[PDB]
């Protein structure tokens, strides 16, 4: 009836968005090099643990050609592999049966470029069936992919995609959740290379490690904003409970029909199973990923990178920015400025301006992803939250990343536990 309580409730998707300041880290999955998942983090503590100093950590790469490919054929069969195990590792315990927004992100290709290997038309068509051809040797039958709307990106500095992404959700206030793919390593260079670039030089064919070839680095990164699904919980009783009950694809309403009309949405065509709210459920928030801040590096008037003391300033005002709403303060500092990169000459001063705690000569409060993990490429803005995301949901404590590759621009993403002070009695980072 129309001017009742239960009118008053709501039995369609949200039709608003407010200003969002985060986004939910629903799921991770890791592949880097040989390691997957906790592993990287796990990997990266015990170097803290016989080391100090963050300056003398170094890689944790294994060296030993027995415990890492190194024919062409090993190492094109585990590039496939790790894709295929960090995908299974991000959805294994994510809702199947619901079409998941997907964006695909790999490194930069410029379709221009004459004599590539392959044509823009193939490459486009790689891009587009990368992710969902991934379920089939990940073992994910059940789950669904959906590329989003221009969701293929091509970019060696892809951080954007985050503040894009605050977007999407905003413009869509029926939209739940996200799945963003980072695909990197030298099988991806070489794939989008020009016949006028040697592979070898980009470290690619048989032989052992050599100093600045990409390191096979996946991540799937799955954010959102879980109380969008509310209204789905008043039509779920109503659907039928399929008869293998553990499926939850919803096949029609049972003999009792829903009191209204179900509307369809963009991204909720179909209502929701009593078993797809238990899939969503159970999966806990990992962290909070908060809205990034991005800061120019160079003088608007003469293009030029800021001078030493103005870059200290700039920087400090973003960490100010970036670290006002975190609880409590971060405990340490994920960033990356590529090969052959001193960021600490100018994150220890603008950190120190910024009156951060951090001491970034600690092993345990500062990360240089390609110090320690090898160049992840296009894939290190989610490396940097995958592992923040871990050690904030593990620690209950606050993380920072900071990817730093582009030379004109910094940009900051908090990220914080959901219960700060609480650690879980569960590590869900298992492989």
Known sequence: PRGSHMSADAYHAPKTSPRLETLDVLSIGMSLDVFRQGQVWKALQEQNAVQAEALHVGSILPMDPKKYPTSADDKDMAYEKRQA???????????EKWPIPTVTVVRSWDPSTPNLRFTP???????SVK??????????????????????????????????LFSLFERNPDLPAVLVYAN??????????????????????????VPGTLTDTMVALIVGRPERVDWLRQFAPYTKVNENRIDPEFRGWGWRKPPVEFRPTPFIPQPWTERALEQWDALPVLARLHRPVSVPLTRPDTGERLKRE??????????????????PAPARLFY???????????????????????????SRESY??????????????FVGIALATMASYLNGDSSMVMPLRRKDQATLIGISSPTPGKKPAHDPFGV
């Not at 992710?131 to 039958?141: E, F, I, Q, S, T």
């Not at 240089?368 to 803005?381: K, V, Y």
């Open 85 to 95: 195990d960090a995908l299974e590792l991000g959805l294994k315990n994510f809702l």
């Open 121 to 127: 038309e193939e490459t486009r068509e790689s891009l």
């Open 310 to 327: 103005a870059l200290t300033a700039q920087l400090a005002a973003a960490w100010k920015t970036a670290s006002a709403g975190l609880r």
């Open 336 to 362: 990356d400025g590529g090969l052959n990169a001193t960021p600490l000459a100018e994150l220890t001063p603008a950190l120190g301006a910024a009156q951060s705690s951090l001491d970034l000569l600690d």
């Open 184 to 209: 990197e390593g030298f099988n991806m260079a070489g794939s989008l290379s020009s016949r006028d670039v040697p592979l070898k030089s980009l470290g690619g064919g048989s032989g052992p490690r």
């Open 368 to 381: 240089d992803l390609t110090q320690r993990l090898g160049d992840t490429g296009a894939a290190s803005p």
């Open 131 to 164: 992710v969902n051809d991934l379920r089939v040797p990940a073992g994910l039958h059940w789950h669904r992919i959906a590329n989003l709307q221009d969701g293929i990106i091509c970019n060696d500095t892809p951080e954007g995609v985050l503040e894009a």
